[PDB]
Ligand binder design. Structure first.
Ligand SMILES: *[C@H](CC)[C@H](O)C/C=C\C/C=C\C/C=C\C/C=C\CCCC(=O)O
Ligand SMILES: *[C@H](CC)[C@H](O)C/C=C\C/C=C\C/C=C\C/C=C\CCCC(=O)O
Lengths: 293, 293
């Protein structure tokens, strides 16, 4: 039983990290690159990049704790707690050399603490489509002159009483299609089959709850990061952001400039939030080139 | 056939206005005062203030179109379309004299245009707990350092594909309790019995949909008021806002000073959104004193 199709030459496997059984898909040879997905998705969002990267690198794509086929965390869902799991997972496979890190959406939240605290273990960093949790997220408007905003899910998912689980249960496929397409610039890349796969995966009760616990921990992650951010990142970093509807535009690079000394960014026109699927080829190309320099 | 208990000496009745049958509760004698409820509730939110006002006033409390026992509007749900219905209803009972207006929450949205277009018809005005729809609402934050903001429902309710009705159907009783209490400071007044009453009213399918149609017309209402705001209100007005969790605090009066020449404002400590219920004694006293001047 696999929730998503594994590409040729890759292996679906599990590893215990601090008592928590983590699922991942792994292939390739060479220095290690870890790819970390975001909300609504799983390791599978990288399935197009992974065979290309695996020509020059060892590639590992974990499911975040509680999501996909990984067990929920036993400590908690703030960035610092989850980052321990992802760091220790990567160390098992690259204990003698730095590794590269590519992260999308809440993968950023869940990896930034381990990067800033183990800078010598990270060779190069790619961050795409999510603010690092800090005071800036408090400025994002709740409502726009065009209709619903793109960040009101922060409060919906953070709300207590299990509000999001209760309202979305029974309607997981419907809600996820609306959520994805409303943050997408190009909706045609999400077939009905792909949406069925993602919806069945996050509809598992523990995965549905886990998805929102990351947001229930968001303010704790902001407070954690106010102390972490006294140390700027020193490794080579690239940011990617969509330039169309759902994309973060210039905010991604401009925020990262406050955290990183050596940073380059790109904004991809015609693309929204789901860069690996909406703009697979140009994103794949910029990732591979940046990590191969 | 009453969704809520009519107070002693009042009558539940209906008036056809522009093809639309509006429900209302009415009692008392003297100059007319109209009380307009907001989202999540009906005329019944006024049922404690009405017996007191009726000692000196003719009091009418209609259900907004689509909500309570009132038919949906045949024109639409923008502030200027709904305000026609309420102006016409009031003027059937007060054709020869100005009347007083008290509005709560989206009652403000649905009365402001008729007040500015017919200033000689409004003797005194009391607005509580809502922004008048304008560009200020596009700066309300999606997310706060305390947690979920109070205004993210703007985007939730406005979202297309009938997102809100689709998620909330079958869970209307659960959602109303969460929504009401999360916007309250004095939550203990929302007994299960009272929550049952309001939930069975807005859970009527055309009422659940009507509820969100007001938010789907909000951007139109914003654009309508942009023209109308070029003329400031000339009649004595009072604003009330909660000072506690769910209250709008100083925003209510500060925004109203841009719209009204003659305006006094009160912030009530320990009270959130639902002033008639959370803080009946101070609120009723404030409204009665203001209107009797
Ligand atoms: C993952 C999203 C699925 C994570 O929760 C959020 C990360 C990115 C945020 C979503 C994309 C767009 C965000 C920034 C746009 C800039 C300002 C937004 C404010 C108002 C609006 O137009 O939405
Ligand atoms: C009816 C609400 C049930 C209507 O849709 C909205 C009117 C009232 C909203 C209730 C509370 C709003 C309180 C806060 C206003 C203050 C500043 C705006 C930003 C909100 C925030 O949480 O920071």
């Amino acid at each position: 039983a696999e929730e998503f199709p594994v590409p040729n030459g890759f292996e679906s496997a599990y590893r215990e990290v601090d008592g928590v059984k983590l699922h991942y898909v792994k292939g390739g040879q060479g220095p290690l690159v870890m790819l970390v997905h975001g909300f609504g998705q799983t390791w599978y969002e990288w399935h197009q990049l992974m065979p290309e990267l695996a020509k020059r690198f060892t590639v590992i794509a974990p499911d975040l704790p509680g999501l996909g086929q990984s067990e929920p965390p036993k400590t908690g869902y703030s960035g610092e707690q989850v980052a321990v799991y992802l760091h220790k997972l990567a160390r098992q496979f690259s204990p003698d050399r730095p590794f590269d890190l590519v992260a999308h959406d809440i993968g950023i939240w869940n990896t930034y603490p381990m990067v800033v605290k183990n800078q010598a273990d990270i060779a190069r960093l790619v961050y795409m489509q999510a603010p690092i949790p800090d005071a800036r997220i408090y400025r994002f408007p709740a409502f726009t002159a065009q209709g619903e905003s793109l960040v009101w899910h922060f409060s919906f998912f953070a709300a207590d009483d299990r509000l999001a689980e209760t309202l979305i249960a029974g309607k997981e496929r419907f809600f996820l299609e609306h959520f994805i397409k409303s943050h997408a610039s190009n909706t045609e890349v999400f077939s009905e089959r792909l949406l069925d796969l993602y919806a069945r995966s996050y509809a598992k009760p523990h995965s549905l709850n886990a998805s929102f616990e990351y947001y229930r921990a968001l303010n704790e992650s902001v407070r954690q990061n106010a102390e972490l951010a006294k140390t700027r990142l020193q490794m080579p970093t690239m940011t990617l952001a969509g330039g169309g509807h759902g994309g973060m535009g210039t905010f991604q690079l401009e925020q990262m400039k406050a955290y990183a000394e050596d940073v380059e960014g790109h904004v991809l026109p015609g693309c929204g939030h789901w860069l690996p699927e909406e703009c697979a080829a140009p994103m794949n190309r910029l990732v591979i080139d940046f990590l191969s320099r």
